[PDB]
Symmetry: D2
Subunit: 476 residues, 4 copies
C-alpha cells in the first residue's frame, strides 16, 4: 500500500506526458492546474495508513498490505468489504472525484481473476494485476475513439489511424498509432487502453487491450481548459482540490511491449471482455457506492441551504429535499441488492448482480441532473451572490456580515455554504460534473439499447402468453 | 386457511351492505358487477390448497394451517417467506388487484405483535388478529375523510359528523356517525376503520380505530360507476375479473361493540399507529412485492407488443422497454434492501427497512404513469384497433385474420394481446389503475413532506459542516 | 348548408357500411352505440341555421349558403373567419370531438384551390370539392396502412394487398384491395382515402388518393369496442354524446370510379400533396383552434374542481391551474401567428404560417398528457367517488347530499362536475382522448424528424459561423 | 443617442462604486473583469450610428435622435419597431446579455407614459425619463431584498434595515439604509431601486421607488466571483465579452434627492406599479424578443455540432434539434400575439398583450434548461475535449488537426464551435445563464401563483357550468 509521499515522488520523478496550453507539464505536483488533485490523490493513499481506516482500506497477505480494491472477493462479505472501501474513499471528496484508481483496479482485478478469458495473454494479465497491486500504482484509462464522423464506423473515419490501430508487429511488441478521445485523471503512473464497455470494436486493427506507463515515448495527454477556480478553500471549496482534468490521448507510433498486451486483433474478445470477466460488474459496484456518496453530499447541502435561508418552512422545498432522499434510498437499494444477489461467473469469480448495477448505472444519469436542478431551485439568487473571503476581510466586511447572514447562520458560514453549493453545480467545475454523470459510462441511448438486447425478457413474455390462454379459448 | 367455496358461501350468506345505482346488492357472488372479482378472490384462496403452492402461501401451527400474511416474522427468512406469498398472489392477476386481503393482514399482524401500543385495547387487537387469522376472513378498509372542504381540518367541515365521529358511548360500545371517502374491494367479511398513515387525526372525536362486519346495521357501501367491460376474457381480459370496485362508506349511527375498539379518542396514538407498530413497514412490504409483479406484467406486454408489430427493430422502442427494465430492477432492489436491512422495533417485531420502503412507495407513483405512457407510445393505433371476438367469429373474420396479423403473430393472438394492453392502460379499468397508483398510499405532496420531516438528515448535514471547516479556516 | 334533420335522414337512407361485434349496423341513427354522436353531428349542422351563429358558420354565394369550412380564403380576414367557425363548432363539445367534418373540408378546400397540382385529375378534385360543399356532406378519412410488420415498408408486408393497392384498371375506374388501419367518425356520407401527411408512399401500387360514398359495395368499417358509458348526461356527460368511434377500413376489391380518383400511382405527388396544396396548413389551422377549445375546457374543469373541494387555497394547486393557463396562451399564440403571418403558396392559395402550426401540432401532444395529469392530481379520490344519478334518487340520496357536498357546492352539482372530469380523463372515453392527442397527426418520433428535415436551419447556422469568425482570427 | 466612446468616457470619469475581492474598482473600462462587457455595451451604442441600423435602433424627434427603447408607442407599428430594436441588439450577443439597458428603458418609458399613477411624484418620473432618454444613459436595477430569513416578511428579518428602508426624511430628500440582493450589469450610470414585479412590499418603510447615479456616496456594488474565462475569443468566445456581473447593492445611509423619488411609503402603489403603468408588459416584450434571439443561437449551435461530428444522421439527434425548433416557434408566436393583441391601458399607453407575455415568461424558464440539456446530449465528450488555441499553435498542432477534425469540418473550426457550445452551457459563464433563465423574472413558484390569481378564469368556468346544466336536468 502506497503512501501519499510515494505517489507524489513517483509523479515528480516520472511524470505523465501531459500538455497544457501548448507546453509540456514538467512537474504536475507543483503546477497550478494539477497540484490540487495530486494532493487529493495523495491524501487518499495516506488514508490507507490511518489506524482508523487501515482495516477498511487494506488487507494483509503473506506479510504485505494491499489496497482493498485489489482484493479478489471469495464471499459476499469480501464483496461488502470492497464496497466499504469504495465508499470511504468517495466520501473524502463528497463523491466529486469520478476516476479514483479503485474503479480501474476493480477492472484489472476482475480481468486477472478471469484471466483464462485472454488465452495466450492470460499470464500478462495476471502479472500486470500483481504489478499494480504490489506497487499500488495509480491508473487512468481511455476507451473511446475520437469524435470525428459518428455516422461511420471506426474503419470509416477520414484516416485509418484516427482511432488507435496496430501499425505493425515486431519481436519486441506492437506499434500503435491513433488517439483515444478522453482520459480523466491523467495524474497516474499507468494508462489502460482497453475496449469499450458497450460499443463494438469494428475491425481487428482496433481490437486492442493494453497498458502503458504514462511517460512512454510517443504518448501524449492533451489537457482541456482547466476548471480550477483558485486555491482558496473558501472561494473554491471543490475546484481547488478535485479538478481531475480530462484529456485527449495521442499515440505517435508508440511501442507496446508484448508483456503489456492483453488482447490483440480479436474483435470477439473485445466485445465481451467486461461482461465475461466480471469487470463490468465490479467497476459498476464502485460506481454505485460512489453515486451514493455523491447523493449524500447533495442531500446535506440542500438541507443546509434550505435551513440556512429559512426556505425549509415551505412545502415544495421540503418535497424537493425528500426527492433527493428517495433517490439516495434508490441507490442504496441497488447497492445492497448488487452485493446480496452476487454469484460466481464462468471463471469462478464472485460478481455483484448485474441487474441491480445495470439499474443503478442507467438510472443515475437521469436522477443526477434533477438533483442538481433541485439545488438550483432551493438556492436561487443565493447561488450567485458569492462575495470572496477577500470581501469579508476587506472594508465592507461588517456590511456583508449583516446582509448575508442567514436565519440563524453567520454570514461567513452562509457564504462558505453557498460557495460550495455553487461549486457543486454552477462553476465550470460543477457544470462539468453534470455532463460527466450523463455520459461517463456511455451514451444513454446505446446503454439502454444494450440493456434491452442483453436482458432476459422471456419470463415476463411467457407469463403474459399464459394469461392470454383464456382469451384464445373463446374460439374453441 | 379458507377455500374459495367457503369465501363465496360466506358472502352469499352474509353479504356486505353494498349499494349499486340506488339498489341494495342482494348477492354479490352472482351480481354482474361483482361476480368477477369474487371469483378472483376465491381463486386466491383456493391457491392456498394447491400442493404446488401450499408451502409458500400457508404455514402450519398447532395442527392448523394459516395464511402466510398472518405470520409474525421472527427472522429475515420469515420476512422473505411473507414476501414470496405477496408476490405469488400478486402474479395471479398481473399485479392489477391492489387491495387483496394480505395487505391489510400485514397491518393487523403488526398491530397484534405490537399490541402493547394500544394500552387497554391491546387484548382486543390480539383477539381480532386471531379471529381474522383462524377464520381467514377477507377485509376492506377506509382511512380518509370525505373530500368536502380541504381548506379546513376534520372539525371544520360543513357538519361535525361528515368525518366519522363518536356520537356517544354506552355499556355496549360506541356509536359512530359520518363517512369515509374510499374503500376498495368491499367484497369482504370485515372493514377496518383505522387512522390515516400520514394525516393528523385533528380532534379526539375522530381519533378512532375499529373493525366491523361488513353487514353491520347502519353501515353502507355506496359503489361508484362499475368498470367491468364485459365477461368475455378475449374482449376484457382484466376488467372481467379484477374490477375490485371503490365505494363511499356511510355510518348511520352505527354501534361498534367494545371488543372491536382498538383506539378511542387518542389523537397521539392515531398519529403514530402505523409507524410505532410496524404496520407501515409491513403493509409497504406487500406493496413493493405487488408493484414488482405489476412492472413485470407491463414489461412482458411491452415486449410482446413491440415484437408483435415489428416495432422492436427501432432503437427508441428498445430504449422504452429498457426503461421499464430499469424501473423493475429499482423495485426489486428496494424489496431486497427492505428485507436484508430489517430490524426489530420497540415491541420486538422484526420490520422491513423503512428507508427502502419509503423509497419504493414514493418513487413508484412517479414511475407508473411513465410505464403506462411507454405502452401507449409502443402500441399507438394498435391500442384502439380492437375488434371483438365476435368480429373474428363473424363474416369478416377472414379479412381480420389478414389485416390484423402481426409480423410473425396470428391475428387472434395479436388482438388478444392488444386488448390486454388496452385493458391495462386505456379502458376505464386501465385508466383507474393510473389514478390508483398515483394516490392509494396518500397524496404525493404530503407523502414527500412527511418523508422530509421524519428522515434523519443530520449525518449528511454534519459531513458538509465538516467539509466546510477548511473554508472557514481562511479567516483564522 | 345542411340541417341536422337532413344529415340524419341521409345516414338512415344510405348508412355507412358499419360493422359492430360481427353484425352489420342497419341504422346508426338509432343504434345504441352511434345515436349519440349522430345527434351531436346533427346539432353542429343545425347551429349553422341559428340566427346567432349563421354569419359565423356560413357564407352566402350566388344565392346559396355554404359552410364556412369550404370558404377559399383570399385575405387574412377570411382566414380569421374560418378560424372562428372552427372554434365555435369545437366549443360545442368542449373540444372533445376530434374529427368533425370541417377538418377534412379544410383539406379538400386546399386541394381544390391548388387543383393544378393534381394534373389530369385536377377537374375531379374541383368537382369533388363543389360536391361536398353544395351538399354539405360529412366525411371521414383513413391515411395509414395496417399495423402488421412496421420493420418493413408497405411492399414488404405478409401480403402485397395488406395496404390498399390497385388490383387493376378498367374503363370505369380502378379496383382496389387492402385496408386502412384507422378512420375516426365513420358516421359520414363519404370517406377520403388520401396519402399520409408525413410517411412516404413507398410504391406506385399504393400511391393513391380517392374518395368514396361510405355505402360502396365491398367497403367495410369494422368498429372497435364502443366507449359509450351510457345515455345519462349526469353519469356520462361526454361519452353519451361524443363517442366518434374508430374503425378498421376494409376494401374487398372495391371499384373506384374514375371521377373519384385524384392521385394514381404517383409516389412523388403523394409525398408532397398536403404541403404543396396547403392542405397541411389549413387542416392544422382547424386543429390549433380545436386544441385551444379543448384546453379552455380543461382549465374550466380544473378551476371548478379546485374551488369545489377547497383545494384552491393550496399553492401547488394554484400553480397547476396556472400551468394550464400557460399552455392555453401558448396555443392561442400559435393560432394568432398562424393567421397573421399567412402568405400565398405556389398556387395562389393563402395559407396560415407553417412554422406556427408545426409548433402547435408538435407541442400539444406533449402538453395534453400533462394537462390530463393535472386534473388527476387536483381531483384525487374525488375522480373515482362517482355515485350515479340513481343513487341520489335512491334511499341514500340524503346521505350523499351531506357527504359529497363541496366547500360551497351542493352534492349533485359536485358529483356532476367530477363525473365530467372523470369522463374527460379516466373513463374509457376519456383515456382514449389521451392516446388520440398523442398520435392523431402522426407518430411524434417521425413528426419531429420531419420537422428537422424540412425546416430551414441555415439562418441560425450562419449567425453562429459569423460569430465564430473572431475565434478563428486568432490564428491569422 | 450615445456613442460607445461617450459611454466609455462616462464610466471612466464617474465610475460606479464597484468592489471586487475587497478592493474598489477604479476604472472598469480597463479592469480585467469588466473591460469585456464594457466594450460590448459600447458596441451596442455604436450600432445606433451604423447607417444599416440607425432607422431600426433610433428615431428622430425635434432635431434629436433617441434610442428606440425610449419610444412611447402610439400604434402597433411603433410596438413592432420597439420589438425589432430589442431583437437586433439581442442578436449581437446571441441573446446572452440579459440586462442590456433597453429592458429598463422599457420600464421607465411605461412609468413616464403612465406618470399620473405616481401622483405628486409624476413630474419626477417624467423628468427622469427625459433625462435617461436625452443622455441615453445606461441603467442597472435591483428589486429584491437580501436572502436572509425567507420564512419571515421584510419587517421580520434580523434587523429592520436589512431590506432598504427609510431612516428619515429631510428638506433635501430621504435617507435610506439596507441592501438589495442582486443587480446585474452594474457597468451603468444609474441604478433603479424599484418595487418587486410580484412580491408584496410588506411595510411602508420599504415601499420605495427611486433612482440614483451609481457613484452616489454610501452606495456600494459588491461583485460576486468573476466568470470571465480569459480574453481569447477562441478559448472563451462568450465569457470574454458578455460577463455582465452580478452584485449585492449596499446602502450606507444614502441620501436620495426628492427629485429622484417616484414612490414613497405607499405599499399599494408599489404592489401595482408594473401592472398599472404597463411596465410589466413592455419589459416582458423586450424579454420575449431576447429569448427568441437566444433560442435561435442555440438552434444554430445544435445544428452545427450535429453536422460537425456526423451525429445528424441519427433520428433522436434530429428530434432533439426539432424540439428546439418547436420552442423557437413558440416564443415567436408569443411575441407576435403580444404585439397583435396590444391595447391601451387606463393611462392611454398602448401595451402588448399580457396573456401572451405571461405565457412566454412563465414557459421559457421551463424550456431553457431543456434546450441546454439538448446541447449536452448532442455534444457529449466533444463538449469537454477543449484544447486551447495555444495547443493548435504548439508542437502538437498537427496531431490535433487530425484527431479533432469533424466529418467535413476542419479541426480549428470544430474546436472553435465546441468551445462556444461549452461557453453557452458548461463554463461558469454558461452555467450561470441557466440559473439566470430559471429566476431572473422571479421565483416560478410565486410567478405561477401570481398568474393563477390575476387571470380571469370565469369564462371557462361558465362554459363548464353551462355544459353541466344537462347533467342536473335529470333530477327535474
Ligand atoms: C466529463 C467526462 C469525463 C469522461 N471521462 C472518460 C474517461 O475517463 N475514460 C473514457 O474512456 N471515456 C471518458 N469519457 C467519455 C464517455 O464515456 C463518452 O462521452 C460516452 O461514452 C459517449 O460517447 P461519446 O462522447 O463518444 O459521444 P458520441 O458517440 O460522439 O455521440 C454524440 C451524440 O451522437 C449520438 N450518436 C452517435 N452515435 C450514435 C449511434 N450509433 N446511435 C445513436 N446515436 C448516436 C449520441 O447519442 C449523442 O447524442 C468522459 C466523458 C465526459 C463527458
Ligand atoms: C382508485 C383509488 C383507490 C383508493 N382506495 C382506497 C382504499 O382502499 N382505502 C382508503 O382508505 N383510501 C383509498 N383511496 C384514497 C387515497 O388514499 C387518497 O386518494 C389519497 O390519500 C389522497 O387524499 P385525497 O384523495 O383525499 O385528496 P385530497 O386531500 O382531497 O386532495 C385533492 C388535491 O388537493 C390537495 N391538497 C389538499 N389538502 C392539501 C394539503 N393539506 N396540503 C397540500 N395540498 C393539499 C392535494 O395535493 C391534491 O392536489 C383510493 C384512491 C384511489 C384514487
Ligand atoms: O465504454 C465506453 O464506450 C465508454 C466508457 C468509457 C469509460 C468507462 O469507464 C466506461 C464507459
Ligand atoms: O393514509 C392515508 O391518509 C391514505 C391511505 C389510505 C389507505 C391506505 O392503505 C394507505 C394510505
Ligand atoms: O420582481 C421580483 O421580485 C424579481 C425581479 C427582479 C428583476 C426583474 O427585472 C424582474 C423580476
Amino acid at each position: 500500500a502506497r503512501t501519499g509521499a510515494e505517489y507524489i515522488e513517483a509523479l515528480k520523478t516520472r511524470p505523465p506526458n501531459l500538455w497544457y496550453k501548448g507546453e509540456k507539464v514538467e512537474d504536475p505536483t507543483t503546477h497550478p492546474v494539477f497540484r490540487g488533485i495530486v494532493r487529493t490523490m495523495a491524501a487518499l493513499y495516506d488514508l490507507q495508513h490511518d489506524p482508523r481506516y487501515r482495516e477498511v482500506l487494506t488487507y494483509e497477505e503473506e506479510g504485505k498490505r494491499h489496497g482493498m480494491s485489489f482484493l479478489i472477493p471469495k464471499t459476499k462479505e469480501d464483496l461488502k468489504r470492497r464496497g466499504q472501501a469504495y465508499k470511504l474513499w468517495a466520501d473524502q471528496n463528497l463523491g466529486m472525484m469520478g476516476r479514483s484508481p479503485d474503479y480501474l483496479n476493480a477492472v484489472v482485478m476482475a480481468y486477472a481473476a478471469s484471466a483464462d478469458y485472454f488465452g495466450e495473454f492470460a499470464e500478462n494479465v495476471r502479472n500486470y494485476y500483481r504489478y499494480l497491486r504490489d506497487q499500488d500504482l495509480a491508473t487512468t484509462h481511455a476507451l473511446t475513439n475520437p469524435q470525428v464522423n459518428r455516422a461511420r464506423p471506426p474503419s470509416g473515419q477520414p484516416d485509418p489511424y484516427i482511432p488507435v490501430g496496430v501499425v505493425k508487429q515486431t519481436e519486441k511488441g506492437i506499434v500503435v498509432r491513433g488517439a483515444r478521445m478522453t482520459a480523466t485523471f491523467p495524474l497516474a503512473d499507468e494508462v489502460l487502453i482497453f475496449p469499450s464497455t458497450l460499443l463494438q470494436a469494428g475491425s481487428e486493427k482496433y481490437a486492442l487491450a493494453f497498458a502503458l506507463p504514462t511517460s512512454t515515448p510517443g504518448l501524449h495527454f492533451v489537457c482541456r481548459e482547466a476548471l480550477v477556480g483558485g486555491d482558496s478553500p473558501f472561494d473554491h471549496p471543490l475546484s481547488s482540490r478535485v479538478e481531475e482534468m480530462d484529456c485527449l490521448v495521442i499515440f505517435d507510433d508508440v511501442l507496446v511491449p508484448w508483456e503489456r498486451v492483453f488482447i490483440l486483433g480479436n474483435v470477439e474478445l473485445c466485445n465481451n471482455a467486461y461482461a465475461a470477466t466480471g469487470a463490468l460488474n465490479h467497476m459498476a459496484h464502485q460506481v454505485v457506492a460512489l453515486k451514493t456518496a455523491k447523493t449524500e453530499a447533495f442531500l446535506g447541502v440542500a438541507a443546509l441551504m434550505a435551513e440556512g435561508i429559512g426556505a425549509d418552512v415551505y412545502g415544495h422545498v421540503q418535497e424537493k429535499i425528500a426527492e433527493i432522499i428517495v433517490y439516495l434510498e434508490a441507490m442504496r437499494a441497488f447497492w445492497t441488492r448488487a452485493e446480496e444477489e452476487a454469484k460466481e461467473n464462468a471463471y469462478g469469480l464472485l460478481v455483484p448482480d448485474r441487474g441491480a448495477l445495470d439499474g443503478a448505472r442507467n438510472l443515475y444519469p437521469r436522477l443526477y441532473p434533477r438533483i442538481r436542478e433541485i439545488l438550483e431551485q432551493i438556492g436561487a439568487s443565493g447561488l450567485i451572490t458569492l462575495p470572496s473571503e477577500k470581501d469579508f476581510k476587506g472594508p465592507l466586511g461588517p456590511f456583508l456580515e449583516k446582509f448575508l447572514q442567514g436565519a440563524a447562520l453567520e454570514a461567513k458560514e452562509r457564504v462558505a455554504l453557498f460557495r460550495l453549493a455553487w461549486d457543486m453545480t454552477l462553476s465550470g467545475f460543477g457544470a462539468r460534473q453534470e455532463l460527466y454523470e450523463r455520459f461517463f459510462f456511455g451514451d444513454p441511448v446505446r446503454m439502454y439499447q444494450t440493456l434491452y438486447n442483453v436482458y432476459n425478457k422471456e419470463p415476463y413474455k411467457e407469463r403474459i402468453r399464459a394469461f392470454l390462454k383464456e382469451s384464445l379459448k373463446v374460439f374453441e
